[PDB]
Ligand binder design. Structure first.
Ligand SMILES: CCCCCCCCCCCCCCCCCC(=O)OC[C@H](CO[C@@H]1O[C@H](CO[C@H]2O[C@H](CO)[C@H](O)[C@H](O)[C@H]2O)[C@H](O)[C@H](O)[C@H]1O)OC(=O)CCCCCCCCCCCCCCCCC
Ligand SMILES: CCCCCCCCCCCCCCCCCC(=O)OC[C@H](CO[C@@H]1O[C@H](CO[C@H]2O[C@H](CO)[C@H](O)[C@H](O)[C@H]2O)[C@H](O)[C@H](O)[C@H]1O)OC(=O)CCCCCCCCCCCCCCCCC
Ligand code: CLA
Ligand code: CLA
Ligand SMILES: CC(C)=CCC/C(C)=C/CC/C(C)=C/CC/C(C)=C/CC/C(C)=C/CC/C(C)=C/CC/C(C)=C/CC/C(C)=C/CC/C(C)=C/CC1=CC(=O)C(C)=C(C)C1=O
Ligand SMILES: CC(C)=CCC/C(C)=C/CC/C(C)=C/CC/C(C)=C/CC/C(C)=C/CC/C(C)=C/CC/C(C)=C/CC/C(C)=C/CC/C(C)=C/CC1=CC(=O)C(C)=C(C)C1=O
Ligand SMILES: CCCCCCCCCCCCCCCC(=O)OC[C@H](CO[C@@H]1O[C@H](CS(=O)(=O)O)[C@@H](O)[C@H](O)[C@H]1O)OC(=O)CCCCCCCCCCCCCCC
Ligand SMILES: CCCCCCCCCCCCCCCC(=O)OC[C@H](COP(=O)(O)OC[C@@H](O)CO)OC(=O)CCCCCCCCCCCCCCC
Ligand SMILES: CCCCCCCCCCCCCCCC(=O)OC[C@H](COP(=O)(O)OC[C@@H](O)CO)OC(=O)CCCCCCCCCCCCCCC
Ligand SMILES: CCCCCCCCCCCCCCCC(=O)OC[C@H](COP(=O)(O)OC[C@@H](O)CO)OC(=O)CCCCCCCCCCCCCCC
Ligand SMILES: CC1=C(/C=C/C(C)=C/C=C\C(C)=C\C=C\C=C(C)\C=C\C=C(C)\C=C\C2=C(C)CCCC2(C)C)C(C)(C)CCC1
Ligand code: OEX
Ligand SMILES: [Ca+2]
Ligand SMILES: [Cl-]
Ligand SMILES: [Cl-]
Ligand SMILES: [Cl-]
Ligand SMILES: [Fe+2]
Lengths: 243, 97, 38, 334, 195, 137, 200, 37, 30, 34, 34
C-alpha cells in the first residue's frame, strides 16, 4: 500500500486507478437503495483539436497536439449522487471535486490551444434497465464549460471583466469601435458532452473503470477570438457506494 | 453588440442591495446577525425566485427567520450571472482590504 | 528524453574529469618562477 | 612527452592567443551552450508561462519583441526550484512553454563565469603576476549570482529570477522595490555609492593622468602617440597631478602614491558592489529596507507623512499591480 | 533646474534628501518609464562602465607591480619622483589579451578612455532628462500597443512594466501631488487579484 | 491636535455610558495590542480574515455589539463569530483559551479594558486608515 | 582552504535555516517562507470552506483552482503563487496529505482547530520584515516589532559565507603567488612575459 | 608573421571616381522609378 | 523586417569582435 | 501614391554602397606616395 | 507588427554612413607610406 513519498514527483499522482484484467464482473443495483459515486477520476491521454476549415467547407478533422502543461491534467476525487431512475437507468449528478483543469496543448505549426478541461455539474445517464453495472454499461451526458478565465482576469493591457480598465489606455485617442471586441470582455458558458465506456467492473468492491471521450470548447480568451473544438480521450475510474 | 455584464448588472438592483443570487458572501457583514451562519446558508441555497423564498431554507431557527425578515428590505434578487457565481467567487471574489 | 540526458551526463563528466585531473597535474609547478613547491 | 602530458602543456600554455587553462576547459563549453541557447531563444523562443498561471509571456523577437522589450523569460512558477533540464520535459514544445531556456542559460552562465574568474587567477599565476584581479571580478559575478540564483532560491522559484532582457530587467527591479523597498536598504545605497563613486574616480583619474601627460608630440598629432607600448618611463607626471589635485582640495586629501591610489581605485567600486550584491542576496531572504511607514506621529496620533511614506505609496502601486493574476490571497508571502 | 522648469513648478524637482531622491526615482519610473529611455541607458553604460574600468584598472595595476621593495606590503616600494613605471604595462596587456581577447597597449589612450566613458554617460543622461522636462518620453513602443490592444494574449515584459507604472501613478499620486486634490475611490484603484 | 480627554472618551456599554481613559491607559492599550493582536490586526484590518475589521461601525453591527468596552472585553474572554452563533475560542485568542494562546495568560482584566480602549480610540485618531488596509497607508 | 570550506558551510547553513523545519523547528525559529505561504493558502481555504465554498471545484481567475490544483507531476497542491512551495512539508499540514497529495475529503472533514490556529500563526509570522524589524511586507505600516529569526540567520550567514569566499580567493591566490615567489610583484630584470613570444 | 609578398597597392584615380559616381547615380536615377514602382 | 535588422546588427557586432580580436594591429615594444 | 515602401531603402543603398566603395578607393589612392 | 516603416531606412543609414566614413579613413590610412 503506497504513501505520498512513494508517489511524489513520479507522475503516478496524475493517474487514475486501474483494475487488473480479472475484474470483469457485475455490480448489482438495488433499485430500493440510494447510491453515490465517492470518487470519479478522469485521466486524459490524448487531446485532439478540430482544425479550422481552410474554406473548402468539407469535414474538418480532429488533429493530434502536444501537451505542454505537463502532468497537470487529471480530474479526480469527484463525487455526486447516483440516482436510480424509474426506468432503471442510472443518472450521475456531479456535486463536487477537482472537476476542472486548465490545459494548453500545441498544434502543428505552434498555435497554442488553452482549454478548461472539465465535467463541472456533470449529469450523465446510462441505458434503461441496468439491473447490474457491467462491462456493457455506458454513461452519456453533458457538462458546463465556463470561461477559461474567471471575471477578475486582466489582459496584458489591464483590461478585464470584473476588474480592470475598460479601454485601450495606451491608445488614449484611438477610435474605440475597432477595439470593442478587445476592450469588452465576455464570459463564456457553453455545453460539453462525454461518454464513459465501462471496460472493467469489480462486483465485490463497487469499483468501475473504463475509457472516456469528451467534446468541448476551448478558451475563447474572454470573447476576444473564436474557440476551437476539442475532443478529449482517456481512461476513467469510479467507486460506487450505497449511501 | 458587446456588453460588460458585471457593469450592466451594476445598473440593476445588484448595484443597490445585496443580491441573494450573485453578491459575494462578504456583503452580509453590512447588517446585524447575517454573518457568517445565515450568509452561508443563503449562498448555499441560492438561486431564489423571490426575496421571501429565503425564509424557506430548511433547518432555520425562529431567531434566524426573524433576522431574515427584518433584513428582507436589504435583499434583492436578479437573474443569476455566471460571471459572479463561477469560480466560487461568491465565497471569495479576490477582494480583501 | 533519455538519450539527450545520457549524452549530456557523459559530456559533463568528461569535462569535469579534465578539470580535476588537470589541476591535479602538478599545477603549482606551472609558473614562470619557483617550481619546487612539493 | 606522452599524449596527456602534451595536452596539459597545451591547455596551460601561456602562448595561446586566448588562454584556455583548466578553468577554461569548463568555461568554454558552458559559455558556448549558454550563448547559443540564449541567442537562439532571443530570436525565436515562443511565449513562456512565467508565473505558472497559464499566461504566457512572449520574449522573442519573432514573436513581437524588439531589442529593449525582448527577453528570455524565467522558468515557470510551477517548477519553482525544481531542476528542469530539457530531458525532464515530454517535448521541446513543453520545455519551451515552461521556460527551460532560462534555467539552461543561467546555469551554464553562472558556471562559465565562475570559471572565467578562476581563469583570471590561473593565467595571473601563469604570467608571474599578483593574483587578485579575479577578486576584483568577484563583485559583478556575485551580483549575477544574487539575481539569477540566490534570489530565486530565497523566494523558492526561478520564476523570480531576473529575466534575460532589458525590459524584463526593469521589471525585476520594480518588483524588487515593491517587495523589499530596496532603495531604503543601506546595502543598496552602498551599491549606489559604489557605481556612482566608481564613475567619479574613473573620470577623476582619467582626467588627472590625462592632465599631466608629458609633452612628446605636436599639436597636429594625437597625444596618444606620445606614449609607446612598453616604455620604461612613466608617461605622465604624477607629482604634477598630485600638485594639482592636492591644491584643488587639500594636500593630504591627495595621493602621492600611485600604488595606494590604484588600490583605492580597485577597492571602492569593488567593495561597494559586493555590498550591492549582498543587498540583493539578503533581501533574498526578506530582510528588507528600512521601514519608516508612519514613523512620524503628532501629539494626538495623526499620521504625519515623510518622504518614506510617499515612497511607500509608490511601492503600493507596484505591489498591487504586478503579476495581476497570480494572487488569490491578500498577502504576498514570497 | 531644466526639468522642473519644463514642468509646472519646482515642486516636481528632486527634493534634497535621501528618501526624497528615491521618490524622485520611482516617480520617474511610473510617470516617465525612464528606464525605457535610451539616454538613461547610455547613462547606465557610462556609470557601470566607469566603475568597471575603475575596478579593473586599479586591480590590473595592483597585480602587475614590479617588485620594488623587500616589503610584502607593496605600497612603500614606490617613490613619487621615480622615473620608471610602477607596474608592467606589457604583462597586463598580455594577461587581458589572453583572458579577454583585447587589451589596452597605450596608457594615454587607457586613461583618456577612463575620462571619456563616465563623462559621456552622464552627458547622455542629462540630455534624456532634458527630454523629460517636456514629458517627451520613451514611454511606449507603438507597435507593441497596437498588437497588445488587438491581442489580449500578447504580453511582454514591457506591458508588465506598464502595469507597474500605472499602479505607481494611481497609488502614489494623491499624496505625492496634494495640490491636485486627487480623490481616488477604492473602486478606481487599479489592483490585481488579492493584493 | 492633541490626545484630549474627549478623544479618550469611548463607550463603556450599550446604555449610553462612557468611560474616560487616561493617556497611560491608551499607551498601555497600544503596547498590549501590539503584543497580542497586531500580528493579525495590524492597522485595524484582519489578515487571516480581511472580511472582518476592527472599524467601529463594524463592531457596532456585530452580535452582541462590540462597539463598547464591555463588548470587547467579553469578546476577549469568549469570542464569537460576527452573528454570535458559535464560540470560536478554539481558533481565536481569549482568556478561555489561554492554554492554547499562551500570550493571553498574563493578560489581566485591566489589560483587557486597556486593549479594548485602544480598539475604540484608534479610529477616532486615524480615521479611514483604521481598518482601511493598504489603500490608506 | 579553511576559508573556502567555511564559506561552503556558511552557504549550506543559510539554506538549512531557510528551508528546514526539523533541526530548525518553526515553533522556536518561526515558519519558513514556504511554510507561511502555504499557511496563507490553508487559512483562506479553511475560511471560505467555512463560508460554504467548494474548494476543490473552485476555479480561480486564471483557470487554475483558486484553492487547489496540480503540481507539474499531478500532486494536489495549494494554488495561486503558493504553487512554488508544494515541496513544503510540515507537521500541521501532512494530516491533510493523502497518497496523491492534499486529500479533498480530509480537507472537507478532518481539519482540526489546532491546524487552523497553526496556519494562522505561521501565515502572520511569515519571514518578512525591515532592517529596523518592522514585520510584514515592505509596504506594511509600523505596528509589529518583528523580523523572523530565519531571516536574521540566513542573511547573516550569506553575508559571512560570501566574504569568506572572497577571503578564500584572496588567500589562495596569495599562497600561490608567495609559493611561486612573486606575491610582491614582477622582477624588472626578469619579467616573465618579456621572454614570451608575441601573441600576434 | 612573415609578410605576404603578393600584396599589391590598389588605385582609383580621380577621373575613375567621377566616372564611377556618374555610372551609379545615373543608373539609380533610371531604376529608382522601378524600385518605387 | 525589424527582426532582420536586429539580428543583422548583432551579427555585425560579433563579426566585429572577431576582427577586433584576431585581426587587431599588434602591440609593439619600441 | 501607393509606392513600394522598400523603394526608398533600395534606391538609397543602391546609390550609397557602390559610391562609397569608389570613394574608399579614390581616397586611399590619393594618400599613396607621389 | 505595426512598426514605423522608416525605421528600416533610418537604422540602415545610421549604421552604414558613419561606418563608411570610418572605413574610408582607415583604408586611406593603411595605404600611406610606412
Ligand atoms: C567545491 C564546490 C563545488 C561546486 C561545483 C559545482 C557543482 C554543482 C553545485 C550545485 C549548486 C546548487 C544549485 C541549487 C541551489 C538550491 O536550490 O539551494 C537550495 C537547497 C535546498 O533546497 C530546498 O530544500 C528544501 C527541503 O525542505 C524540505 O524538508 C524540510 C524538512 O524540515 C521541510 O519539510 C521542508 O518544508 C521541505 O520542503 C525543499 O526541498 C526545497 O524544494 C529545496 O529547493 O540548499 C542546498 O542544496 C544546500 C546549499 C547549496 C549551495 C547554496 C547556493 C550558493 C552558491 C552560490 C554562491 C555565490 C558565489 C559568489 C562567487 C563570487
Ligand atoms: C560615500 C558615502 C556613501 C553613502 C552610503 C552610506 C551607507 C550607510 C547609510 C545608511 C545610514 C543609516 C541611517 C540611520 C537610519 C535610522 O536611524 O534607522 C532607524 C533604525 C530603527 O528605526 C526605527 O525602527 C522602528 C521599528 O518599529 C517596529 O519595532 C518597534 C519597537 O522597537 C515597534 O514595535 C514598532 O511598532 C515596530 O513597527 C520604527 O520603525 C521607528 O520609527 C524607526 O525609527 O535603527 C535600527 O534599526 C538599528 C539597526 C540597524 C542599523 C544598521 C546600520 C546600517 C549599517 C550599514 C553599513 C555597513 C557597514 C559595515 C562595516 C564593516
Ligand atoms: C543600474 C541602474 C542605474 C544606474 C547605473 C543609474 C545611473 C544614472 N541614473 Mg538612474 N535610475 C535607475 C537605475 C539606474 N540609474 C532607475 C531604476 C531609475 C528609476 C526609473 C532611475 C531613475 C533616474 C533618474 C530619475 C535619474 C537618474 C539619473 C541617472 C544618472 C545619475 C548621475 C549622477 O550621478 O548624478 C548625481 C548628481 C550630480 C552628478 C550633480 C552634481 C553633484 C555635485 C558635484 C555634488 C557636490 C556635493 C558637495 C561636495 C556636498 C556634499 C554634502 C554632503 C553632506 C551630502 C546616472 C546616469 C539622473 C539622471 O539621469 O541625470 C541626468 C536622474 O535624474 N536615474
Ligand atoms: C559574528 C560571527 C558569527 C556568529 C555570532 C555566528 C553565530 C551562530 N552561527 Mg555561525 N558562522 C560564522 C560567524 C558567526 N556565526 C561564520 C564566519 C561562518 C562561516 C561562513 C559561520 C558558519 C555557521 C554555520 C555553518 C552554522 C553557523 C551557526 C550558527 C549559530 C549556532 C552556532 C553553533 O551552534 O556552533 C557549533 C558549536 C561548536 C562547533 C562548538 C562545540 C559544540 C559541542 C560539540 C556541542 C555539544 C552539545 C552536546 C548536546 C553536549 C551534551 C553532553 C551530553 C553528554 C549530556 C549561531 C547562531 C549554525 C546555524 O544556525 O546556521 C543557520 C550553523 O549551522 N554558523
Ligand atoms: C562673499 C564671501 C564673503 C567671499 C569670501 C571668500 C574667502 C576668500 C574664502 C576664504 C575662507 C574660506 C576658506 C572659508 C571656507 C568656507 C567653507 C568651508 C566652504 C565649504 C565648501 C564645501 C561645501 C566644502 C566641501 C568639502 C570637500 C570639497 C568635499 C569633497 C572632497 C573629497 C571628500 C576628497 C576625499 C576623496 C578622496 C578619496 C579622493 C581621491 C580619489 C580620486 C580623486 C583619485 C584620483 C587621483 C588622485 C590623485 O591625488 C592623483 C595624484 C591622481 C593621479 C589621481 O588620478
Ligand atoms: C540575438 C541578438 C539580437 C541578441 C541581442 C540582445 C541583447 C540585449 C543585446 C544587447 C544590446 C545592447 C548592447 C544594449 C546596450 C546598448 C547601449 C546602452 C550602449 C550605450 C552606448 C554608449 C555610447 C553609452 C555612452 C557612454 C559610454 C561610451 C559607455 C561605453 C562603455 C565602455 C565600453 C566601458 C569599457 C568596458 C569594457 C569591458 C572595457 C574593456 C577594457 C579592458 C581591456 C581593461 C583591461 C585592462 C586594465 C588595465 O588596468 C590595463 C593596464 C590594461 C592594459 C588592460 O587591458
Ligand atoms: C570608532 C570606530 C572604532 C574602530 C573600529 C575599526 C573598524 C575597522 C576599520 C577598517 C580598517 C581599514 C584599514 C585600511 C588599510 C589599508 O587599506 O591599507 C592599504 C593602503 C595603505 O595606505 C598607504 O600606506 C602606505 C604605508 S603602509 O603600507 O601602511 O606601510 C603608504 O606608502 C601610502 O602612501 C599610504 O597611502 O591604503 C590605501 O591605499 C589608501 C586608503 C584607501 C582606503 C581603503 C579602504 C577601502 C575602500 C573603502 C571601502 C568602500 C566603502 C564604501 C562603499 C562604496
Ligand atoms: C583588512 C580588511 C579587508 C576588508 C575587505 C577587503 C577590502 C580591500 C580589497 C578590495 C579588492 C579590490 C581589488 C583587489 C586589489 C588588490 O590587489 O589589492 C592589492 C593591495 C596591495 O597588495 P599588498 O601586497 O601591498 O598587500 C596585501 C598583502 O600581501 C599584505 O601586504 O592589497 C591590499 O591592499 C589589501 C588591504 C587590506 C586592508 C584594506 C581594508 C579596507 C576596507 C575596510 C572595510 C570598510 C568597509 C565599510 C563600508 C561602509
Ligand atoms: C574567453 C575569451 C572571451 C572573449 C569574448 C569576446 C570579447 C569581446 C570584447 C570586445 C571586442 C570589440 C572591441 C572593439 C574595440 C577594440 O578593438 O579594442 C582594442 C583596444 C586596444 O587599445 P590600444 O591601447 O591597443 O590602442 C590605443 C591607440 O590605438 C589609440 O587609438 O582596446 C580598448 O580600447 C579597451 C576599451 C574598449 C573595450 C570595449 C569592450 C566592450 C565589450 C562589449 C561591449 C558591446 C556589447 C555588444 C554585445 C552584443
Ligand atoms: C569632433 C567632436 C565631436 C563631438 C560630438 C559628440 C557629442 C557628445 C556629447 C558630450 C560628450 C563629451 C565627452 C568627451 C570627453 C572629452 O574630453 O573629449 C576630448 C576629445 C579631444 O581631446 P584631445 O584633443 O586631447 O585628444 C584625446 C584623444 O587623444 C584620445 O585620447 O574629444 C574627442 O575625443 C572627439 C571625438 C568624440 C566623439 C564622440 C562620439 C560621437 C559619435 C556621434 C554618432 C553620430 C551618428 C551619426 C549617424 C549618421
Ligand atoms: C550528520 C548529517 C547527516 C550525514 C552527513 C554526511 C555523512 C555527510 C558527509 C562526509 C563527507 C564525504 C562530506 C564531503 C565532501 C568532501 C569535500 C568538500 C571535497 C572537495 C574537493 C576539492 C576541494 C579538491 C580540489 C582540487 C581538485 C578538484 C582537482 C585538483 C586540485 C585540487 C585537489 C586542489 C545527514 C546528511 C544524513 C542528515 C543531517 C545531518
Ligand atoms: O512571482 Mn515574480 O513577484 Ca516574488 O512576490 Mn509573490 O512571487 Mn510573484 O508576487 Mn510578488
Ligand atoms: Ca462497453
Ligand atoms: Cl508585473
Ligand atoms: Cl469595509
Ligand atoms: Cl497564493
Ligand atoms: Fe593609472
Amino acid at each position: 500500500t503506497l504513501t505520498y513519498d512513494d508517489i511524489v514527483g513520479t507522475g503516478l499522482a496524475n493517474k487514475c486507478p486501474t483494475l487488473d484484467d480479472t475484474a470483469r464482473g457485475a455490480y448489482p443495483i438495488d433499485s430500493s437503495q440510494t447510491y453515490r459515486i465517492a470518487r470519479l477520476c478522469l485521466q486524459p491521454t490524448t487531446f485532439l483539436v478540430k482544425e479550422e476549415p481552410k474554406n473548402k467547407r468539407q469535414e474538418a478533422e480532429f488533429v493530434p497536439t502536444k501537451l505542454v502543461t505537463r502532468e497537470t491534467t487529471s480530474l479526480d476525487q469527484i463525487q455526486g449522487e447516483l440516482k436510480v431512475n424509474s426506468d432503471g437507468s442510472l443518472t450521475f449528478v456531479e456535486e463536487d471535486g477537482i472537476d476542472f483543469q486548465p490545459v494548453t496543448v500545441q498544434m502543428a505549426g505552434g498555435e497554442r490551444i488553452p482549454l478548461l478541461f472539465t465535467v463541472k455539474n456533470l449529469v450523465a445517464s446510462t441505458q434503461p434497465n441496468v439491473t447490474s453495472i457491467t462491462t456493457s454499461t455506458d454513461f452519456k451526458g453533458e457538462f458546463n464549460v465556463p470561461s477559461y478565465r474567471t471575471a477578475n482576469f486582466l489582459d496584458p493591457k489591464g483590461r478585464g471583466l470584473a476588474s480592470g480598465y475598460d479601454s485601450a489606455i495606451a491608445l488614449p485617442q484611438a477610435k474605440e469601435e475597432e477595439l470593442a471586441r478587445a476592450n469588452v470582455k465576455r464570459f463564456s458558458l457553453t455545453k460539453g458532452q462525454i461518454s464513459l465506456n465501462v471496460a472493467k467492473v469489480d462486483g465485490r468492491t463497487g469499483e468501475i473503470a473504463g475509457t472516456f471521450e469528451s467534446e468541448q470548447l476551448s478558451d475563447d480568451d474572454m470573447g476576444a477570438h473564436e474557440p476551437h473544438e476539442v475532443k478529449i480521450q482517456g481512461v476513467f475510474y469510479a467507486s460506487i457506494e450505497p449511501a | 453588440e458587446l456588453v460588460n455584464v458585471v457593469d450592466e448588472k451594476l445598473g440593476t438592483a445588484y448595484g443597490e442591495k445585496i443580491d441573494l443570487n450573485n453578491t459575494n458572501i462578504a456583503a452580509f457583514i453590512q447588517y446585524r446577525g447575517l454573518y457568517p451562519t445565515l450568509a452561508k446558508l443563503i449562498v448555499k441555497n441560492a438561486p431564489y425566485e423571490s426575496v421571501e423564498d429565503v425564509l424557506n431554507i430548511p433547518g432555520l431557527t425562529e431567531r434566524q427567520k426573524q433576522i431574515l425578515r427584518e433584513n428582507l428590505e436589504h435583499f434583492t434578487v436578479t437573474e443569476v450571472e455566471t460571471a459572479l457565481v463561477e469560480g466560487g467567487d461568491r465565497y471569495n471574489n479576490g477582494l480583501y482590504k | 528524453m533519455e538519450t539527450l540526458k545520457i549524452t549530456v551526463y557523459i559530456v559533463v563528466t568528461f569535462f569535469v574529469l579534465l578539470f580535476v585531473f588537470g589541476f591535479l597535474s602538478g599545477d603549482p609547478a606551472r609558473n614562470p618562477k619557483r617550481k619546487d613547491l612539493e | 612527452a606522452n599524449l596527456w602530458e602534451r595536452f596539459c602543456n597545451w591547455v596551460t600554455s601561456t602562448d595561446n592567443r586566448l588562454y584556455v587553462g583548466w578553468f577554461g576547459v569548463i568555461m568554454i563549453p558552458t559559455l558556448l551552450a549558454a550563448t547559443i541557447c540564449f541567442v537562439i531563444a532571443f530570436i525565436a523562443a515562443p511565449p513562456v508561462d512565467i508565473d505558472g498561471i497559464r499566461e504566457p509571456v512572449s520574449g522573442s523577437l519573432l514573436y513581437g519583441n524588439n531589442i529593449i522589450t525582448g527577453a528570455v523569460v524565467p522558468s515557470s512558477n510551477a517548477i519553482g526550484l525544481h531542476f528542469y533540464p530539457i530531458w525532464e520535459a515530454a517535448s521541446l514544445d513543453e520545455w519551451l512553454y515552461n521556460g527551460g531556456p532560462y534555467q539552461l542559460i543561467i546555469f551554464h552562465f553562472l558556471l562559465g563565469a565562475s570559471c572565467y574568474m578562476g581563469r583570471q587567477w590561473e593565467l595571473s599565476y601563469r604570467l608571474g603576476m599578483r593574483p587578485w584581479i579575479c577578486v576584483a571580478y568577484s563583485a559583478p559575478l556575485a551580483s549575477a549570482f544574487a539575481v539569477f540564483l540566490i534570489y530565486p532560491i530565497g523566494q523558492g522559484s526561478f520564476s523570480d529570477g531576473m529575466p534575460l532582457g532589458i525590459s524584463g530587467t526593469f521589471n525585476f527591479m520594480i518588483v524588487f522595490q515593491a517587495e523589499h523597498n530596496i532603495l531604503m536598504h543601506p546595502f543598496h545605497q552602498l551599491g549606489v555609492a559604489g557605481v556612482f563613486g566608481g564613475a567619479l574616480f574613473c573620470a577623476m583619474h582619467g582626467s588627472l593622468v590625462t592632465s599631466s601627460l608629458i609633452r612628446e608630440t605636436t599639436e597636429t598629432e594625437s597625444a596618444n602617440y606620445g606614449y609607446k607600448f612598453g616604455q620604461e618611463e612613466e608617461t605622465y607626471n604624477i607629482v604634477a597631478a598630485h600638485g594639482y589635485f592636492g591644491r584643488l582640495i587639500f594636500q593630504y586629501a591627495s595621493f602621492n602614491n600611485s600604488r595606494s591610489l590604484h588600490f583605492f581605485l580597485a577597492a571602492w567600486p569593488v567593495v561597494g558592489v559586493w555590498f550591492a550584491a549582498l543587498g540583493i542576496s539578503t533581501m533574498a531572504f526578506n530582510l528588507n529596507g528600512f521601514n519608516f511607514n508612519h514613523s512620524v506621529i503628532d501629539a494626538k496620533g495623526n499620521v504625519i507623512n515623510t518622504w518614506a511614506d510617499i515612497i511607500n505609496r509608490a511601492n503600493l502601486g507596484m505591489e498591487v499591480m504586478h503579476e495581476r493574476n497570480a494572487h488569490n490571497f491578500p498577502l504576498d508571502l514570497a | 533646474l531644466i526639468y522642473p522648469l519644463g514642468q509646472s513648478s519646482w515642486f516636481f524637482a528632486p527634493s534634497f534628501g535621501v528618501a526624497a531622491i528615491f521618490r524622485f526615482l520611482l516617480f520617474f519610473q511610473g510617470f516617465h518609464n525612464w528606464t525605457l529611455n535610451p539616454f538613461h541607458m547610455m547613462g547606465v553604460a557610462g556609470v557601470l562602465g566607469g566603475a568597471l574600468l575603475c575596478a579593473i584598472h586599479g586591480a590590473t595595476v595592483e597585480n602587475t607591480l614590479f617588485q620594488d621593495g623587500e616589503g610584502a606590503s607593496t605600497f612603500r616600494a614606490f617613490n613619487p619622483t621615480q622615473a620608471e613605471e610602477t607596474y608592467s604595462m606589457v604583462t597586463a596587456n598580455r594577461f587581458w589579451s589572453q583572458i579577454f581577447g583585447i587589451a589596452f597597449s597605450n596608457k594615454r589612450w587607457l586613461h583618456f578612455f577612463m575620462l571619456f566613458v563616465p563623462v559621456t554617460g552622464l552627458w547622455m543622461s542629462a540630455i534624456g532628462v532634458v527630454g523629460l522636462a517636456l514629458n517627451l518620453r520613451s514611454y511606449d513602443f507603438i507597435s507593441q500597443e497596437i498588437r497588445a490592444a488587438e491581442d489580449p494574449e500578447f504580453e511582454t515584459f514591457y506591458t508588465k512594466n506598464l502595469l507597474l507604472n500605472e499602479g505607481i501613478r494611481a497609488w502614489m499620486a494623491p499624496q505625492d501631488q496634494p495640490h491636485e486634490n486627487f480623490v481616488f475611490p477604492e473602486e478606481v484603484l487599479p489592483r490585481g487579484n488579492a493584493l | 491636535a492633541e490626545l484630549t480627554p474627549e478623544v479618550l472618551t469611548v463607550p463603556l456599554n450599550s446604555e449610553g455610558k462612557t468611560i474616560t481613559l487616561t493617556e497611560k491607559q491608551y499607551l498601555e492599550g497600544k503596547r498590549l495590542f501590539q503584543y497580542a493582536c497586531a500580528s493579525c490586526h495590524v492597522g485595524g484590518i484582519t489578515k487571516t480574515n480581511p472580511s472582518l475589521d476592527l472599524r467601529t461601525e463594524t463592531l457596532a453591527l456585530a452580535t452582541p455589539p462590540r462597539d463598547n468596552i464591555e463588548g470587547l472585553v467579553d469578546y476577549m474572554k469568549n469570542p464569537t463569530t460576527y452573528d454570535g452563533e458559535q464560540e470560536i475560542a478554539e481558533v481565536h485568542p481569549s482568556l478561555r483559551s489561554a492554554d492554547i494562546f499562551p500570550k493571553m495568560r498574563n493578560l489581566t482584566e485591566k489589560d483587557l479594558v486597556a486593549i479594548a480602549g485602544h480598539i475604540l480610540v484608534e479610529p477616532k485618531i486615524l480615521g479611514d486608515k483604521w481598518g482601511g488596509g493598504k489603500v490608506y497607508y | 582552504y579553511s576559508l573556502g570550506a567555511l564559506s561552503m558551510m556558511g552557504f549550506i547553513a543559510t539554506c538549512f535555516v531557510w528551508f528546514n523545519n526539523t533541526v530548525y523547528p518553526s515553533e522556536f525559529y518561526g515558519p519558513t517562507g514556504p511554510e507561511a505561504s502555504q499557511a496563507q493558502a490553508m487559512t483562506f481555504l479553511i475560511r471560505d470552506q467555512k463560508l460554504g465554498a467548494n474548494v476543490g471545484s473552485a476555479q480561480g481567475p486564471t483557470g487554475l483552482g483558486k484553492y487547489l490544483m496540480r503540481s507539474p507531476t499531478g500532486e494536489i497542491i495549494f494554488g495561486g503563487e503558493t504553487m512554488r512551495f508544494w515541496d513544503f512539508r510540515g507537521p500541521w499540514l501532512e494530516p491533510l496529505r493523502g497518497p496523491n497529495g492534499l486529500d479533498l475529503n480530509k480537507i472537507k472533514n478532518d481539519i482540526q482547530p489546532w491546524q487552523e490556529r497553526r496556519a494562522a500563526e505561521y501565515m502572520t509570522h511569515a519571514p518578512l520584515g525591515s532592517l529596523n524589524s518592522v514585520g510584514g511586507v515592505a509596504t506594511e505600516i509600523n505596528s509589529v516589532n518583528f523580523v523572523s529569526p530565519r531571516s536574521w540567520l540566513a542573511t547573516s550567514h550569506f553575508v559571512l559565507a560570501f566574504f569568506f569566499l572572497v577571503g578564500h580567493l584572496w588567500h589562495a591566490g596569495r599562497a600561490r603567488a608567495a609559493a611561486a615567489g612573486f606575491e610582491k610583484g614582477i622582477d624588472r630584470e626578469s619579467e616573465p612575459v618579456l621572454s614570451m613570444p608575441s601573441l600576434d | 608573421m612573415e609578410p605576404n609578398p603578393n600584396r599589391q597597392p590598389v588605385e582609383l584615380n580621380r577621373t575613375s571616381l567621377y566616372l564611377g559616381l556618374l555610372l551609379i547615380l545615373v543608373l539609380a536615377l533610371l531604376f529608382s522609378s522601378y524600385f518605387f514602382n | 523586417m525589424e527582426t532582420i535588422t536586429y539580428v543583422f546588427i548583432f551579427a555585425c557586432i560579433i563579426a566585429l569582435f572577431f576582427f577586433a580580436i584576431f585581426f587587431r594591429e599588434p602591440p609593439r615594444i619600441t | 501614391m501607393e509606392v513600394n515602401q522598400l523603394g526608398l531603402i533600395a534606391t538609397a543603398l543602391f546609390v550609397l554602397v557602390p559610391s562609397v566603395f569608389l570613394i574608399i578607393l579614390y581616397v586611399q589612392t590619393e594618400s599613396q606616395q607621389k
